[PDB]
Amino acid sequence: AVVKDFDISKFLGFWYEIAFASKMGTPGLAHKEEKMGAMVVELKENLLALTTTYYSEDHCVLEKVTATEGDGPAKFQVTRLSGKKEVVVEATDYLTYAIIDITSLVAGAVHRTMKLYSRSLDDNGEALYNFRKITSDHGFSETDLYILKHDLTCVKVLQSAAES
Amino acid sequence: VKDFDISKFLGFWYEIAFASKMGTPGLAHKEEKMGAMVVELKENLLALTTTYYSEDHCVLEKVTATEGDGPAKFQVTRLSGKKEVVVEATDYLTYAIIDITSLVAGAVHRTMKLYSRSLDDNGEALYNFRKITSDHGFSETDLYILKHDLTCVKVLQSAA
C-alpha cells in the first residue's frame, strides 16, 4: 500500500475529482467542454462499489464498478472487460483529500493516471500543491495535469442518483 | 509589492491563471488557450501587448500605462473608463501576480492574473495565487488555469 494505515471506512461517501494527470493522448480530459467528475464509494461486503460520473462527450456517464483488495492496505484491483486497473492510495490526510495512482491494462496498454479526489469544492490549495509535487515525482509534466472545471452537470446527476 | 523596478519585468510573460467573477464565460468557449503578455518601456510609459482567447479567437490588445502613485500601480486610461493594475506579489524572478480593476463603460471588473516567465514548474506561484485570490475574495470556483494551447502565445511571439 503507499498509505500503510488505511481504512476504507474513512473514505466512504462522496468525492469530487478535482484533478488528474494522464500522458500523450488528446483531449482525454473531456472533449469540447469539461465537466467535473465525482465518485461515490460504497462498502458492499468484501467489495468496494465505486460509482463515478465523467462526460463521455454527449452525456454524463454513470459508471459503477466493483473493486477488491489487492495485497497491501490501500491497494485495490478493478477488473473490467478491457483489463485490470490497479489503484493505489498514494497520500491522504484522512479528512479532505486522497491522491490515487491508477495503472490500467486496457487493450495491451499500461498507462498510469493519477487523480486527486476531494471531499469539497473549496480550499483545495494544499491538496493541489501536493498533487503537483507527487505527479512530478512520478514523471508527469505541468502539461499532463488537468484541473477540472467547476461545471457540475455530471456531478449533480451523480449526487441525485445517489440521494434517492 | 514595496520596492519595484520595472526593468526586472520587461519581456515576455505567459498568463498561467486568472481569477474573475465575470464573464460571458471565462477565457475560452471550449478549450482555453494560454494568454501572454509583452512588457515594453516606450517613451516613459509602459507599453503592454497582451493576447488571450475570447470566444473563438486570439485577441491581441496593445495598451499604454502611466505610473499611478506608488511603485507598482499603473493606470491604463481607455476611452474614459480606466483599468488600474497593481502588482500584488512577485518573486522578482519567475512570476508576478497582478490585480486589475476595470471600468469598462459602467461595468466594473476585478480580475487577478498570474503571469510567469516559464510554462513549467509554476506549482509554488499557483499555490500562492490560490492564497492571494481567496484573501481578495475569490472562490476556488473563480480560478481558471489556462490550458497549454500555445496558438495565441505563438501569435504574439512572432510580432503581434
Contact (CB<8Å) B148/A142: yes
Cα–Cα distance for residue pair B130/A98, rounded to 1 Å: 20
Of B155, B130, B128, nearest in space to B35 by CA: B155
Evaluated on CA atoms A128, B26, A53, A25, the torsion sign reads negative
Residues A117, A18: contact at Cβ < 8 Å? yes
Take residue B57 and report the three cell numbers written for it: 479567437
Residue B117 burial (C-beta neighbours within 10 Å; 0-12, 13-18, 19+) = middle
> Resolution to 1 decimal, in Å?
2.1
Cα–Cα distance for residue pair A92/A106, rounded to 1 Å: 27
Cα–Cα distance for residue pair A88/A102, rounded to 1 Å: 6
End-to-end Cα distance, chain B: 29
Residues A127, A120: contact at Cβ < 8 Å? no
Residues B62, B77: contact at Cβ < 8 Å? no
Instruction: Provide the shortest C-alpha distance from residue B95 to chain A (in Å).
Output: 16
Cα–Cα distance for residue pair A10/A82, rounded to 1 Å: 30
Q: Which residue has the cell 488528446?
A: A26
Contact (CB<8Å) A142/B121: yes
Cα–Cα distance for residue pair A152/A38, rounded to 1 Å: 9
Cα–Cα distance for residue pair A95/A11, rounded to 1 Å: 8
Experimental method: X-ray
Best residue in A126, A128, A133 for a mutation probing chain B (most B CBs within 10 Å): A128
Residues A87, A78: contact at Cβ < 8 Å? yes
Residue A136 burial (C-beta neighbours within 10 Å; 0-12, 13-18, 19+) = middle
Take residue B16 and report the three cell numbers written for it: 498561467
CATH code for the structural domain at A1-164: 2.40.128.20
Chain B residues with CB under 8 Å of a chain A CB are 119-124, 126-127, 130-131, 134, 139-141, 144-145, 148
Q: What are phi and psi of B61, to 5 degrees?
A: -105, 155
Residues in contact with A163: Cβ distance below 8 Å, sequence separation at least 6, in sequence order? none
Residue B79 burial (C-beta neighbours within 10 Å; 0-12, 13-18, 19+) = exposed
Of A24, A33, A75, A76, nearest in space to A57 by CA: A33
The matching CATH number, chosen from 1.10.600.10, 1.10.10.350, 2.40.128.20, 2.40.50.140, for B1-160 is 2.40.128.20
Antiparallel, parallel or unpaired: β B11-20 and B143-145: antiparallel
Cα–Cα distance for residue pair A89/B35, rounded to 1 Å: 35
Residue B38 identity: V
Residue B113 identity: K
Of B114, B84, A143, nearest in space to B76 by CA: B84
Take residue B94 and report the three cell numbers written for it: 519567475
Contact (CB<8Å) B122/A129: no
Cα–Cα distance for residue pair A24/B144, rounded to 1 Å: 22
